Design a binder for this molecule. Sequence first.
Ligand SMILES: [Ca+2]
Ligand SMILES: [Ca+2]
Ligand SMILES: [Ca+2]
Ligand SMILES: [Ca+2]
Length: 669
Amino acid sequence: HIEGRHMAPKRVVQLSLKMPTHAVCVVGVEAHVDIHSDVPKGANSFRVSGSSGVEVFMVYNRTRVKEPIGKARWPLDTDADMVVSVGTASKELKDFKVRVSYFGEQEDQALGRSVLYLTGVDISLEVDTGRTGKVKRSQGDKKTWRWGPEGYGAILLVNCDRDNHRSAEPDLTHSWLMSLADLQDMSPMLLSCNGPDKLFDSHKLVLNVPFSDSKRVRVFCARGGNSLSDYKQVLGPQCLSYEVERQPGEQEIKFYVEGLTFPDADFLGLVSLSVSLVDPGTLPEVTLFTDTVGFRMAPWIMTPNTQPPEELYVCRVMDTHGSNEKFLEDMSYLTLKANCKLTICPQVENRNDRWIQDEMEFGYIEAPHKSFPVVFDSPRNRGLKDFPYKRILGPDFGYVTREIPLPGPSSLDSFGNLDVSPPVTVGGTEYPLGRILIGSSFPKSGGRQMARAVRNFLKAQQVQAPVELYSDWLSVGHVDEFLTFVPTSDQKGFRLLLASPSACLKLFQEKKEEGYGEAAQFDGLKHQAKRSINEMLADRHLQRDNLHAQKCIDWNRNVLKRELGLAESDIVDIPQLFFLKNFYAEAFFPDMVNMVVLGKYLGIPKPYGPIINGRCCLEEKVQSLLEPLGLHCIFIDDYLSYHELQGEIHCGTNVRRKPFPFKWWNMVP
Ligand SMILES: [Ca+2]
Ligand SMILES: [Ca+2]
Ligand SMILES: [Ca+2]
Ligand SMILES: [Ca+2]
């Protein structure tokens, strides 16, 4: 005795021995007919035959056992029902026939007959279902989505880009079509309406989207034909329904669908669209049939450093009494060996904001095919605020962002704190697109990534599925300081680079073990006080700093090894020394771990360490650690224009990379 339920309408066709009755039916859908409606003259049972292409079944009042009626006389008391099915689309109104004749024993033959005419219709909302090509035909009713190589329901791109140079904003925001090319960013939906036109003049087709999903999708259709001006928006944010304009000869109508919103805390990615069929000659109005399809918003995906470089971004900034042009030339040199485009953001756009790693994260979106990259513009909002929205966003490039309450952003909101791992299979559960890595304060306290918004947005994608690291011990507090990845021919393969104070102290002591002992730091050049190998080691302040730092990096090591399914062969420890200011960790010398990775070419900040027999020993320690993997180590001076400001090469650059060959829809999150 449940209180209340939304329950499906029941259309039951009445019969008359006096007058023939007519009925509408959609192909492949049962038509409930009432044989008990008019029963003649104390008749004992019945016989019903119909034709042609008509099927008649009896269904006991449980959910199961269609039992087809033969030529055999059926008792008039059964568990009550009759169902008729029309196999094709009717060429003319009332061209299917079904006749019922009632019997008795109590003969000769029928004591009366009831006549029922049927009009067959084909109503199917169809989308792209096996992922290829164009829309496909599923009835065959299946689930709206399934996650494997298995097969599922449809995919939809969130449309953000300007294939339009008329407007400053992505086509997402507009209620009318602008470019024709914008249609290439949209998913096809075919509405099959097949039958007599005289039928459609009474019963009407209506196309709906739920209010929940109203603002997440736009649906366009061309009534006119095949010209930019003929496209109207049939469904949108404030339009929940479309009364289909169907001209008599046209039995299949094409629709175009575009996603308004990426998956978020409020949205799990599933959007449902409906084509119903109603009979307006009725109040209450009846809906005779409904077909519902579904879409899945293509998630935002990140590319790890192990991916091949395409375009590197560095901004020309100058001042503190100087210029970074030299660094820019180093970067040109370095980029054009890797064969990748080098984009230099001039000074007038960046307002001397040199960190282009923090402002945005490069990513991509993908459909059966249309695949184009998307920028995630950070809430950071300092000197680069307008760069992604103005400079980047364009015909094939996307824009997405999340704004922030007060008083955000914090430093943890900078996207240098947002990274992602190379593809990794862990404990039987595989992550082909990698795993997102964001820094936070140690669990059980402190400032998080100051956007609960971007966090929500990142875990919502349900793909790479972010793990949280501990960056807060660092003054700037980005994961890119102590962490990175490099590509390798073996094994998985790739290797994770961790900052290792203990390894650095180790190196210095083992070279103190040789004559070698007093070669100093910041040797290469200087206005800044030289210092040694042995009062490193003799000083214990800095080693409190470095043992603490190494401890924190050890914690992050346990987390990373656990979550990414890593073994010590995967990890490589790059020597790095830190120091403490106001309880927070800065870098003692430029941070080598923070570096730009382009293929086997690694742009690295140049530490100035002990000079022993012609070389910086730290540099060559690194070379000995890396080069055997095939990685050529290039050392670039970032010192005055970057390190002085507590940032390094990777942090002063931003790299867009080639999307994964693997297709996100083929994994199982
Ligand atoms: Ca577009
Ligand atoms: Ca911004
Ligand atoms: Ca496009
Ligand atoms: Ca990053």
